């Protein structure tokens, strides 16, 4: 077979496995483990001078170039007018290939074809391996990899022309609905399994030849942003409370990471709009409509001031724009002063710049239209005492009001941070604007009963602790127990968490 | 033969050589060197009252304009309905073929038909010969060149008329996949080799003719830098441990000073299997890693425009373990501390003489780093041309500074000077054992080292050193050979590589 | 007569057309040429002016006294060490004058409106603009931008009044020298002008520019017209707070004694911080350079002296001066 044909060609003969975990401090080695049918990996640490230990892809034997150029012209004369429809592609090759007679076994003709038809190509065999987090094609070259065993690899696949790479490239992009151009080389995207892809396009560009990154669908959750620090138990109980209640909220500044996963706080009946400049967002609800931009130079752009201004016709309970620094600012708050509730990113460190840079040119937002926005969030990259970078919510703001008098913003920080302790510090009990006097007048109740609001609270923040101890963390296990939260009442959910 | 045809026309007969490096600060020579085979340069420093120094193209004897219009005929008949296939090496060869079986000596016929066709044509020599920077043909005259040796230097190489110049600004620009017209008339290109070429055509916007300007592979290392007297061995050890490290270090200066060249000597020093990104303007780095990508900036004059700034923002993206930048100066400096401060390590080149400018112009406008964004680069050298006791130009690290934090009380920098210079002895000195911030309160707390340890610290920084100068002893230079010793060194480990080296 | 016109402008690389009616240019034997094409615009007619290739040269705009001689060595001694240095207010005439002053063997490109300057240096580009009406056109901005694909040594712009202005200053901050002219009296208006818009150089932008020169037309007392420089200054920073440029005047203008008066041997803040850092010198051997400055004034009287005016003669001894150094030059000249 094809495998014991390569694995008899080597000098020693490779051990098995199929879990690398073991070599884990192994710095030598000489393993062979499987991915799929037809791809099989072999990892040899042999002493090569610039450190890249070897990852060599062991593949099926290809046809000749003119064996598939024939059953290319004979595929591509059929179906001229017109997973599943995967599985129809399959009977077309047999159905021109049961006259055919390879040199190589059909099944291996089968999967080449299948492979850079319907797939990623070479690289396929890199995308299915699950034990590969990185994938650079820097140049001309051989594909690196960063492998979460090994570290750094360089792979066995390699592209020797700059033809190759841009066809590589191009067909990649186009295959992820964002096909790069000359007029715009640099492209983000993601592919089917919802890998991230980085591509630039153009020797022109890029002048060792167009090269691609590769980032190994799965958002992080909210009680994972609360393992890792970043947010407090209490800050997510809160947060959640302002968007069960539609509250518009910057979230400023890893500030995708944080806005993705602070979504499955909706409740999960709302419309939701996405609004994006690369799609990364991923929302949970069912009636998600998620849109993207389009550029093309003049005639058929579509700019997120334009989706932003579509958004309005389109009965959104939540309308999120991925990241806003230009006119569809402007529309953003025309949505909020209109009833539609908006999130989002944004560049900047503090209210103060928040502040200028949302009524400044070009966004111009109307000071007298700034109180709209009810929480301005803010994070940051810090380094901890180990030296390692940790992400931290620095500070919470509650947006009341711009100062006629002074032209200055006024607000209330909800959250502060402490450095030392590396806590997040709640304003407390007697301290939100927004729970007071929003919330309150919204939700019909008087200032005798305003503790019930502060107890709910309580119980939100005592729930995603829960969560986070017994383990929870998988962004649509989370989704699941903060619906069932909702199905079955705080305090009888809180409940059975409690015996998991 | 072709050379010594030419070579005994002469009344004084010239030296040999090839490497007119010896030739630096004497203003006096006779000497021809080789560039390929059919191309031999002649310098000579004529007394030239305008100050241009003599730089004779040496080429084979051309067929007559009848003989070549001929061959082109002949050759223009065949392959007619044939494609010019793809690729540029074997299609080459190809031509060769062609001529071959159609056909002065007939090697020369071949030289000159290949390089005005496959090449540069008459500019060919000066595209080929490593020791030419810049190269301009500003009108009708002659080419004029900037020699690394030598400066400017007038050349054999005259066009007489419109035309020629014309031809050749069109040609060119067709070769470079950018061809001139007279609605624009301007462009910028490259050329196969890298070199980056501007064009300007027609007469009726370059008054004195059609001008052309090239702008011009083996990097200076990082031991011809220690020998040159720039950096001393002790602080390309310095270099080498923050560098493996992963600390953030820019290369300042002022004009010339050569920092471009000591950024691309010390990147030897990042571990070889790490990914390195390039983004700049002007493709002036040649990096030996393998899992490198390499970007250059882009202008239209509006859309499809890239710049610094979209390119650095773009490298967050692609898992680089280092950013290199050209050289900082607009809003892609603030992205550049914003890719610090999420875990990516980054160098650069900077225009500031010391680090108080170089802190003001990054919290300035146009560059805005916030201050407290500043910690973040952790060494910042400064290096300057000056003038030795002979009156030569020669470059030397003036200082290399341990950025610290901004103190909150004064808004001024707080940093620690690791080495710095005596103009005197003309002699790097090392701030010392007790003296690196860097070395004990960010290494030894990432590589989980104690206090009473950290003199293990020092030893190996000392044993890198040791280390570089057995390199500069054995006369290790160039670029890719002391490349292969770094990685020998890392391979083997330092005691074990410095006994290898020590017995070459 | 709009025959003539047409064929004459295009044979002066520079055609008339209805759109664009006026243009100047120069002839073959470098005459200038003033064009106005179309009776819808010279109503008696299409017209022409001819006025009658030989830069005025800067020994000549001594010997008429618009510059002293200390006061071309030291614009001599700047452009020498690649100094950036405006000409404002007869700009152009000085500023092609003291060209001869940069090192022979440098690029010059020159960028221009109207084929004005004439270049001495052997590796001379000169560019002009070309307006179209739309595709095609070539504007200032365009070249200069060109200017820094160029390897130019110096690039001087004939006249800066646009977003070119934004860009000459983006050349000096990445080591290309510049050049130029402009209208204004003063430095207050020359700097206004240059941090408004259009140009919009930034203020951090402006110590870029080393040396503002300014001249005027004057009556002298028997009422005939004389170009006078009425003040050089050193440009060193913009004030943070006060948000005004930081200036010493190099040289002013004494209108009583018809004299230009030199600021002094301690006064010159280029050629103490930016020139002895430059040149590699010490505080104690700071006179050396204004010792050389005084032979440099020396040599280009003793020019004037011995009738050395033509151009291209004035440019072969300032040649001569860089060959057999300033001392042996200045004794060849004294016995001539």
């Given at each position: 077979?094809?495998?014991?044909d390569?694995?008899?060609?080597l000098?020693?003969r490779?051990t ?12 030598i080695?000489?393993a ?10 072999h990892?040899?640490?042999i002493?090569?001078?610039d ?6 892809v062991?593949?099926?034997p ?5 064996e ?5 012209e004979?595929?591509?004369?059929s ?18 290939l ?11 003709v ?7 038809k ?10 299915r ?12 070259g051989?594909?690196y990899?960063?492998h979460?065993?090994?570290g750094p690899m360089?792979?066995s ?5 700059y033809?190759?790479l ?5 067909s990649?992009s ?6 790069v ?8 995207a ?11 396009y ?11 990154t590769?980032?190994k ?11 890792f620090?970043?947010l ?8 959640w ?7 518009n909220?910057?979230?400023c ?12 706080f ?17 929302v949970p609800?069912s009636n998600?409509?998620?849109?993207v ?13 334009d ?31 209109t ?16 502040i200028?840079?949302l009524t ?14 009810n929480?301005a969030?803010?994070?940051t990259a810090?380094?901890?005492?180990k030296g ?8 919470v ?9 002074t032209?200055?913003?006024v607000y209330?920080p909800?959250?502060?941070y402490d450095?030392?302790?590396d ?15 929003k919330?309150?007048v ?7 009963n ?17 969560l ?26 809180i409940?059975?968490?409690s015996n998991?």
């Amino acid at each position: 077979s094809f495998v014991e044909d390569y694995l008899t060609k080597l000098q020693e003969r490779p051990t098995i496995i199929e879990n690398p975990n073991i070599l884990k401090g192994s710095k030598i080695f000489n393993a062979i483990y499987r991915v799929d049918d037809f791809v099989y990996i072999h990892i040899q640490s042999i002493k090569s001078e610039d450190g890249y230990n070897q990852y060599n892809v062991i593949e099926p034997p290809r046809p000749t170039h003119d064996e598939m150029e024939e059953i290319e012209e004979k595929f591509a004369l059929s179906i001229g007018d017109k997973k599943e429809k995967e599985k129809l592609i399959r009977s077309i090759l047999d159905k021109i290939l049961l006259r055919m007679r390879l040199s190589v076994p059909k099944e291996y003709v089968i999967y080449h074809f299948i492979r850079d038809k319907l797939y990623t190509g070479s690289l396929e065999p890199l995308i299915r391996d699950p034990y590969i987090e990185d994938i650079s094609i820097p140049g001309l070259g051989h594909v690196y990899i960063v492998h979460k065993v090994f570290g750094p690899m360089r792979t066995s696949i390699k592209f020797e022309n700059y033809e190759e790479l841009d066809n590589l490239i191009v067909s990649l992009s186009e295959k992820s609905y964002r096909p790069v151009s000359h007029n715009r080389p640099v492209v983000d995207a993601s592919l089917p399994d919802g890998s991230r892809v980085n591509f630039v396009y153009g020797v022109d560009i890029s002048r060792r030849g167009s090269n691609l990154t590769v980032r190994k669908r799965v958002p992080t959750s909210i009680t994972q942003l609360i393992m890792f620090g970043t947010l407090s138990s209490m800050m997510a109980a809160y947060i959640w409370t302002m968007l069960d209640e539609g509250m518009n909220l910057f979230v400023c500044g890893g500030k995708t990471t944080t806005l993705n996963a602070i979504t499955a706080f909706i409740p999960p009946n709302l419309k939701i709009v996405t609004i994006e400049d690369t799609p990364e967002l991923t929302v949970p609800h069912s009636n998600w409509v998620a849109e993207v931009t389009r550029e093309t130079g003049g005639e058929g752009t579509i700019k997120l001031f334009d989706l932003l201004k579509a958004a309005l016709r389109q009965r959104p309970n939540y309308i999120l724009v991925g990241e806003i620094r230009d006119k569809e600012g402007n529309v953003a708050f025309q949505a909020m002063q209109t009833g539609h509730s908006v999130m989002a990113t944004f560049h900047a460190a503090n209210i103060t710049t928040l502040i200028q840079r949302l009524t400044g040119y070009p966004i111009e937002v109307p000071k007298s239209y700034i109180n709209n926005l009810n929480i301005a969030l803010f994070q940051t990259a810090l380094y901890d005492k180990k030296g390692n970078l940790i992400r931290r919510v620095v500070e919470v703001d509650e947006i009341i009001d711009i100062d006629p008098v002074t032209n200055d913003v006024v607000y209330i920080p909800a959250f502060t941070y402490d450095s030392v302790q590396d806590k997040m510090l709640f304003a407390g009990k007697g301290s939100s604007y927004l729970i007071e006097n929003k919330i309150a007048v919204k939700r019909g109740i008087d200032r005798r009963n305003i503790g019930l609001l502060y107890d709910e609270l309580q119980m939100r923040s005592r729930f995603l602790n829960l969560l986070v101890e017994k383990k929870i963390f998988n962004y649509y296990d989370v989704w699941d127990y903060i619906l069932r939260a909702r199905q079955m009442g705080l305090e009888e959910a809180i409940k059975y968490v409690s015996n998991i």
